[PDB]
């Protein structure tokens, strides 16, 4: 197949109202644990929600589903696609773990691929900072010039369901769940492939109203969804966002009119104000006392304007 090492993407179609869906999730988890230990690290699951609290709260997830449905013909839940390799109307069944394993291994093929994509992530310091994702890769000669697309997802693990999951036992959590698609078009951004086969795409995004803890970014190079003959995912890369490097720099802001500082474990503002509130790096309102090292956001209302200051307690 190619110069590069193949990773497999699974797109699983699911809903919180679907009583059969937890069973589908666990059958796939079992299948993965049946793989030789090398391949385990090379399978990137994604769960795409439709007609539920998750697609309501994040409507672009519904848009992604609609697109995948147009491409693959998703008849019911739970179902899944291996690297979008199925022609429309083909089998998307989630069978016994061994049958799932066999579908995954078919996705692997000879273990090689004619593209590769590598991810360098940085995380924002607080909920109102952007994260960044730089996707760099290369395609083999035979692919240079072809319309190749890149799609990237922000995936949320250990996620409390929006409404209780039908068919789920105590302490159930969603895993590998798509909450963001980084290309405006859910069908992907067009890749600009240089003569040497290389490409670079950089994204800078604020998390859409969920916490950064236990998040991954998955990116994959793929043929166009609109190509009925071959709309397959060629290769993928994935990294942990919550474990990523912190963004190393701050934006150049205007000369502040409120000079906050840290004295005796607390944030002090000597300028006059109507309200001061301190939030920690996860956006919780916190008591302004004995603050441990970390970054805080101070929201200060003064002179009829609500200001946001980032304070770093060393």
CA distance 231 to 216: 24
Count up the domains in the chain and report the number: 2
Of 275, 262, 285, the residue nearest 307 (C-alpha)? 275
Q: What are phi and psi of 294, to 5 degrees?
A: 155, 180
Say if residue 48 is in the same domain as residue 111. Answer: yes
Contact, 39 vs 107, CB < 8 A? no
Cβ atoms of 13 and 74 closer than 8 Å:
yes
CB 170 within 8 A of CB 233: no
> Three-state SS string across 171-239, please?
CCCECCEEEEECCCCCCCEECCCCCCCEEEEEEEECCCCCCCCCEEEEEEEECCCCCCCCCCEEEEEEE
- Quick one: 285 and 194 in the same domain? no
User: How many Å apart are CA 169 and CA 91, to the nearest integer?
Assistant: 29
Distance of alpha carbon 91 from alpha carbon 79, whole angstroms:
9
**Cα–Cα distance between 299 and 269 in angstroms, integer?**
11
Q: Which residues on adjacent β-strands are paired with residue 299? A: 277, 308
Closest-CA residue to 46 (of 93, 10, 6): 10
At residue 6, the 3 state secondary structure works out as coil
Four-residue CA torsion sign, 50, 81, 170, 19:
positive
CB contact set of 235 (below 8 Å; sequence gap of 6+) = 4, 6, 7, 113, 114, 115, 116, 117, 137, 220, 221
* 172 within 8 A of 161, measured Cβ to Cβ: yes
Q: Which of 227, 250, 273 is the last residue in one of the domains?
A: 250
Longest dimension (CA), the chain: 68
> In this structure, are 132 and 237 located in the same domain?
yes
Last residue of a domain, one of 250, 274, 291: 250
> Is-cis flag, bond preceding 78, omega within 30?
yes
Q: Residue 301 contacts by C-beta under 8 Å, 6 or more apart in sequence?
A: 273, 274, 275, 276, 307
Residues 285 and 210 in one domain: no
Query: Are both 145 and 172 inside the same structural domain?
Result: yes
State whether 16 and 103 are in the same domain: yes
How far is the first Cα of the chain from the last one, in angstroms, to the nearest whole number?
Answer: 51
- How many CA atoms lie less than 13 Å away from 66 in the CB half-sphere? 9
Q: Are residues 270 and 137 in the same domain?
A: no
188 and 58, same domain (yes or no): yes
Helix (H, G, I), strand (E, B) or coil at 42: coil
- How far is residue 126 from each of residues 35, 122, 254, 298, measured CA to CA in Å? 38, 12, 19, 11
What is the chain's alpha carbon radius of gyration, rounded to the nearest angstrom?
A: 22
CB 134 within 8 A of CB 119: yes
CA gap 279, 286 in Å, rounded: 5
- Regarding whether 117 and 215 lie in a shared domain, the answer is yes
Structural domain including 62 reads: 1-250
Say whether both 144 and 236 belong to one domain.
Answer: yes
The domain boundary, picked from 250, 282, 301, lies at 250
Q: How is residue 27 written in tokens?
A: 């059958």
Residues 135 and 281 in one domain: no
Q: Are strands 115-123 and 245-246 parallel, antiparallel or unpaired?
A: parallel
Quick one: which of 262, 272, 264 has its CA closest to 300? 272
Which residues, including other chains, have CB under 8 Å from residue 250's CB and lie 6 or more apart? 310
Burial class (CB in 10 A: 0-12, 13-18, 19+), 72: buried
d(CA 308, CA 302): 11
Name, in order, each residue with C-beta under 8 angstroms of 142's C-beta and a sequence gap of 6 or more.
114
Q: Note the Cα 47 to chain centre separation in Å.
A: 11
Helix, strand, or coil here: 149? strand
CB 199 within 8 A of CB 138: yes
Give me the helices (H) in the chain, please. 21-33, 37-40, 53-57, 59-72, 97-108
Residues 203 and 246 both lie in one domain: yes
What CA–CA distance (Å, rounded) separates 34 from 7?
16
């Amino acid at each position: 197949k190619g110069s590069f090492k193949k990773n497999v993407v699974l797109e699983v179609f699911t809903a919180e109202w679907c009583g059969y869906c937890p069973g589908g999730k666990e059958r796939i988890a079992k299948a993965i644990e049946m793989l030789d230990d090398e391949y385990k690290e090379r399978v990137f699951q994604t769960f795409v929600h439709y007609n539920d609290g998750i697609s309501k709260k994040w409507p672009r997830v519904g848009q992604l589903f609609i697109a995948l449905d147009q491409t693959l013909g998703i008849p019911g839940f739970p179902t899944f696609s291996v690297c979008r390799m199925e022609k429309k109307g083909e089998n998307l069944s989630i069978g016994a773990p061994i049958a799932i394993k066999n579908k995954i291994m078919k996705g692997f093929g000879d273990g090689t691929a004619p593209a590769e994509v590598n991810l360098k992530l940085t995380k924002g310091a607080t909920p109102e900072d952007v994260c960044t994702a730089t996707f760099t890769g290369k395609v083999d000669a035979d692919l240079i010039g072809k319309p190749l697309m890149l799609t990237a997802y922000v995936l949320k693990n250990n996620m409390k369901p929006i409404n209780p999951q039908n068919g789920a036992g105590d302490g159930y959590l969603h895993q590998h769940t798509v909450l963001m698609i980084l290309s405006t078009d859910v069908k992907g951004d067009a890749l600009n492939i240089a003569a040497d086969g290389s490409f670079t795409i950089k994204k800078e995004f604020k998390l859409d109203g969920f916490e950064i803890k236990d998040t991954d970014v998955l990116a994959f190079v793929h043929h166009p969804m609109s190509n009925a003959e071959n709309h397959s995912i060629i290769n993928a890369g994935q990294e942990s966002l919550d474990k990523a490097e912190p963004t190393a720099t701050e934006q150049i802001v205007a000369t502040p009119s409120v000079k906050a500082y840290v004295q005796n474990g607390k944030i002090v503002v000597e300028e006059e104000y109507s309200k001061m509130e301190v939030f920690n790096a996860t956006g919780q309102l916190v008591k302004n006392e004995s603050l441990v090292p970390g970054v805080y956001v101070v929201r200060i209302t003064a002179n009829g304007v609500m200001h946001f200051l980032k304070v770093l307690v060393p």
